[PDB]
């Protein structure tokens, strides 16, 4: 009554027992194996081509199906350690990549490794993108949204980055990948259609994502209907909460390799 499918989903999620939530997080999702790569982020090995974060595999999932084909100048807002930046540098059509994150006592500190094409990567900490001016780009990236147990707080936060991203979409990317932390409220499906009407694109759910978050990524390579695509992911997560759990589909993490300009 009066609630969206996503709203009716997150309510039951907040009422799950500790074990009911633990066994449900990874049930039936796809996940990249990062064990041997975490022994690389600490051994100082920058040559092995490992990923710094799991975001490298997530973006590798999206770029490898035309959901976004980066090129020219690319920009990743909230790069953290640059999981999205180090994969974008391996793309052959891109030239300049710049990452930006604060990395203060509030969040993750950027890491610099030697993945293939690391010379074109510019990751600096100490930036607040909510007070940053938009620069011309051909590929916009944004992975900022922060979880919250209240569907209204996730809404109040997601509209803030979508209003900030409108200044970078005012710089007209050629291919973008914007994360919509909460797309499932009646105010959300409203705005996401309003932005797609003027700037194009569509939303898509990545199998790298957990069952605990309703996050979806607004891409430039998919033209899906908004309300139907969001509701599809809503109904998809609900079925996983009732029956017996299912094993996670493991995969090999990206291997960005090593090298220089080419
Ligand atoms: C940790 N946790 C998260 N969620 C739910 O999953 C959604 C996203 O969960 P997340 O795991 O993706 O979030 P994050 O990326 O920060 O990792 P982590 O698992 O460590 O969760 C930490 C955050 O979850 C929130 N949280 C902690 N405990 C609970 C709880 N009992 N119920 C709801 N939210 C919680 C807190 O705001 C905390 O900051 C949250 O909105 C929440 O409804 C939980 N639900 C139950 N029923 N029991 C839990 O323990 C729980
Ligand atoms: N308001 C803000 N301004 C700048 N960076 C922010 C921000 N809010 C969150 N962030 C940053 O966004 C990052 C998201 S983690 C994403 C990292 C990377 N895109 C990857 O996929 O691997 C966090 O590390 C956090 O530091």
From Swiss-Prot:
In its record, the post-translational modification comment is: Phosphorylated on serines residues. This phosphorylation may trigger NS5 nuclear localization.
What's its job? Replicates the viral (+) and (-) RNA genome, and performs the capping of genomes in the cytoplasm. Once sufficient NS5 is expressed, binds to the cap-proximal structure and inhibits further translation of the viral genome. Besides its role in RNA genome replication, also prevents the establishment of a cellular antiviral state by blocking the interferon-alpha/beta (IFN-alpha/beta) signaling pathway.
Quick one: where's region SUMO-interacting motif (SIM)? 74-77
The name this protein carries in UniProt is RNA-directed RNA polymerase NS5
Q: Which residues of the full protein are shown?
A: 2524 to 2785 of 3423
List locations, semicolon-separated: Host endoplasmic reticulum membrane; Host nucleus
Site annotation Essential for 2'-O-methyltransferase and N-7 methyltransferase activity: residues: 143
- Membrane topology (UniProt): Peripheral membrane protein
Q: Which organism is it from?
A: Zika virus (isolate ZIKV/Human/Cambodia/FSS13025/2010) (ZIKV)
